[PDB]
Amino acid sequence: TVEEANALLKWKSTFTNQTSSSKLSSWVNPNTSSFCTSWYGVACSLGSIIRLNLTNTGIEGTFEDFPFSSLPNLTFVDLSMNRFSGTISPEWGRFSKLEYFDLSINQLVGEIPPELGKLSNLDTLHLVENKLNGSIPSEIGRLTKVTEIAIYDNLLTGPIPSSFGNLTKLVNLYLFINSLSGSIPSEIGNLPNLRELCLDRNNLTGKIPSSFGNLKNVTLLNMFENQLSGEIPPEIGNMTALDTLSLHTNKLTGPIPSTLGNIKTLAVLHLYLNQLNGSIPPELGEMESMIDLEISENKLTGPVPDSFGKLTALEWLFLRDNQLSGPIPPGIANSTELTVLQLDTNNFTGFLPDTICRGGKLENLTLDDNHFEGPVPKSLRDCKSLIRVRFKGNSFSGDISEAFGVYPTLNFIDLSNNNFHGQLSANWEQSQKLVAFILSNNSITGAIPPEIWNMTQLSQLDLSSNRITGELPESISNINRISKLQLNGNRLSGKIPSGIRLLTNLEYLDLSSNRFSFEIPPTLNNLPRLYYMNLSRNDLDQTIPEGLTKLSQLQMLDLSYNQLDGEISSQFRSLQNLERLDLSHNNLSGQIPPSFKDMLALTHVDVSHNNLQGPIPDNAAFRNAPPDAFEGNKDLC
Template sequence: MLSSLSRIYLHANYLQGLIPASIGNLSHLTDLSLSLNELSGGIPPEIGKLGSLTILDLSSNKLTGTIPASLGNLRSLSELYLLNNSLVGPITFIGNLSASLIVLGLSSNKLIGTIPASLGNLRRLSELYLSDKSFGPITSIRNLTASLTILNLSYNKLTGTIPASLGNLRSLSELYLSDNNLFGPITSIRNLTASLTVLNLSYNKLTGTIPASLGNLRSLSELYLSDNNLFGPITSIRNLTASLTVLNLSYNKLTAFDNHFTGPIPKSLKNCSSLFRLRLQRNQLSGNISDAFGTHPILNYMDLSDNELHGELSWTWEQFNNLSALKISGNKISGEIPAALGKATHLQGLDLSSNQLVGGIPKELGNLKLIELALNDNKLSGDIPFDVASLSDLQKLGRNFSATILKQLGKCSKLIFLNMSKNRFTGSIPVEMGSLQSLQSLDLSWNSLTGDIMPEIGQLQQLEVLNLSHNLLSGVIPTSFSRLQSLTKVDVSYNKLEGPIPDIKAFREAPFEAIRNNSNLCGNATGLEACAALMKNKSVHKKGPKFVILTVVSLLGSLLGLIVASNAEERKGGYGVVYKAVLPSEQVLSVKKFHQTPEVEVTSLKAFRSEIDVLMGIRHRNIVKLYGFCSHAKHSFLVYEFVERGSLRKVLNDEEQAVKMDWDKRLNLIKGVANALSYMHHDCSPPITKMFFWIQNMRLMSLILAQLGS
């Protein structure tokens, strides 16, 4: 039925299973594209029967096995894509491929061996992708055809020096040799064709200086030499073509980032109007950059950090209208921050930290849509302008500002990293900080902040790192901190804090150095006393939310009046009895009274304390609330929220009520239980995984929100 079919395009679906051998019966097929699926198994040899096939694309699947030699029968084949599979074996089959082949893609498989000399028989080959392989010495590429325009041999284990024979590839436009083990000088690139547009030699072991012959590559737009052992001045790049858009010399010993480059930035860069990205950070570049750059209308990214550059930022900033990131930290830049920076309208990241800048922060920076702003470790003075402090998209802000900034920052709703350490802040932490709902890291250490820690910090559910150390903060740590389940690192040392630490992982596992030198902290952490021993003869009264403490006298004195005899006892358990209690205010509670006989006194006390430890840290809409507790040698109680419809068992055993609980309500109930269990298993720290879970424990609220009882 499909014998006349000429083209099959089934790429980018979710196809699974094997490629059928019967596909070899489609004798008129010219194009077969099955890429970007989940096909498995081997490539059927029957594909070799498709004598009219010109394009075969099986890339990005889960194919295994060897590449069948029958592909050599496809004499009309011009494009073969087998990338991103798990094919194995040598690539000797290449010698049998059609001489009309133009594109060969074999990257990201598990092929082995050396590049066969027979590859040179593919006289029309234009694009060759053999990355992510183990193809031995690079000398094996000497036989490549002169028609190649793209050669990608990156991520291999190629060894040796860059062969001069690459100069024979007169049509080559893109050469990728990164992530290999190539060594020696790069002088052989003098032979490369002038038509080359991309040269990537990064992540090798190349040595020597950058040759002036790079200037012969008049069409070069992207040059990557990072992560080698190149050294010396980078003055040789003065000859680079004006068409260069990307220059990456990092991690060498040059004057480009992570190298050992020395000397000034070449003046030739000033005239490079097509420059798109410039990364020269972490070198030893020196010289005055006041006049180092000219008109760069498409420059998008510039990083000159951690060098020895000096001078002022007196560039014509309105001509940098495409610049999104400017990083010049760790230099010796002086003068004031130019107000004209506000004219670089696309700027989102500005890092001028660790320089010698003076004066104030220009309000014109408020015109930008900054995400990151770092001006710390300079000699700036004055307040941060209101327009800058109100940047709504700001995500990262460095330190060295006046105290007024803390209140203003409440409008920076997208702030993620806030480091205000080592300033001279006084007074209390402003409540506005609780508005920073995206905050992940907050550092207010080494200031002179006083007063209580505001409970609003407990609202920062994304917070992972909190440092309040080396201040004058006092009082107790707010109970709202128990909600900071994302917190992984905390430091409150060298303050005047007292009372229990929050029962969350970050505090329990904090080193003693992170909680030391306070007034009287207690709790389950290294170096602290247990709160029971510390608080025995002391009551702590602080502002803010707290648990209700029911006194023994008042509870025992009115217990008989609180319990409604007709339905007082809900359930008896191994540790106690649960009562329904009505207060004089008509509030209805569940009261769990623990058995307290001499034989089980120690066991009951341990059970009571264990339950309190767990419940004190739980906050979830599907788990009943603990209102208070009472601990006494003769009587111990827990006071819970009362759930009016009782247990699930009671409802399901009542035929009339069971009928009213339709499937929608039961589904909502199951979802509520799942949410509660997920919270206990994944959001509590440590996870609560050992509980008695039976149908009596399922309590029903009037809206059928599932709650887990005791």
């Protein structure tokens, strides 16, 4: 006691940057009459310290003056969450009776001494969240009584010691955040009591040991973010107690093992980000407990099995970024608990099944870049729980106002590159949480419902490449949160509303290829974030307003194919960031202002088909201009 307490008191002297408010103020009297009862963090047995608990004590120092020789009876040591720096001395293995060893969350460096292997009585080993480098010693396999080994979040290298098969009592192996190398020892598959194996986020090469079929007690197998190769061993199906299997972000090849159906407890399967090929085994429909099924970003082929209808508890089905084909079986959306259905980047065909939102809980549906056709199922129209909908790049058809209902929780929708006809329903206004409405390249006619502007939360609106008619109201100001407005390629007519002035958060304006007919608003001088403005192919009929030059941040400004007349104001020199200018196909007269030579950012100009004259100012843009950039003028020197 007195020898132990004085030795601890000497070790405490090593501590640096220690405040008088520390918990170790109780270390005053070395007599057992205060050592074993009033000293914080120590607990004795038969008068001798067996327990040292100094977690989260803010101690700053090293274990160089740790009294190894003075504390024979230590069995519990937890020095985690402190500022200990240095190495792990081999003297740590001298604690014969030690059962619990925790040095996690520290600033330790160096290797793990093999002397830790002679801690025969050790049950738990925690060396977590440190910067220990080197290979795990083979001698760790000597810890026959160990049950949990956690050395993750470190800088460990080399292979896993195949002597780990000798750790029969091990139930929890945590080594994930590290740089372990080489193949997985086959002996690891022969741990009888193992329950959790987390080898993820490493540099592990080679195949997955077929011996893993013997782990009938394992419920968690995390080995993602590795360089594992070969094929998934079919003996994995014998892992009948598996709850979560994650091999994502690997270099696995070959087909999915049909033996995965035998695991009736598997609720999470993450096979994505790999190179598995072939067809989906119909036996995957027999994985009864499956909740999260992710096989995305692969090279799978063939159709989805109709057996997927037997997955009655599925919630996430990730099949995107693959080479699957054929029709969608109605059983895919059989689940009433389905919430996420990602299918983009595939080669599917045919109609959507009427079971699409059977349970009324679908949130995120993704169908981009496919060959779907036919109408939207009535179950999708009435499915109010949608959040993200992505129909982009298909051949969907039907009346756009008859296809979709109301969606109070809708956030993002993209129906671009489809064959939807009809006029826009005013039902979209009730999607008060919508921030991105993108419906470009369709066959939609009619006018924009005035209620669309009462959707104040919109930040991106894209109705481009359609046949929308009518004129934009001065109520356009109601969506001032917008930053991308793409209304180009339509039959919008009338004057451009002056309410565009008040959309100050606007970044990108595209009103081109339309039938706007009167003069540009002279009040458009307050767009401090606009870097794009395309007003080309219209009928604007007067002089360019001076207020346009007050938008300092334009990079591109296209006013081509118009009826603009008058002289090009010299105040365009103020646009210091302007890179592109297109004023072609107009009736602009006068001389090109020679103050344009001072616009260093300008690179591209087109002034063709106009009524200007005089020698052009000399800048980088005018010099490299081809002969097309000056065609059809009057007297350009």
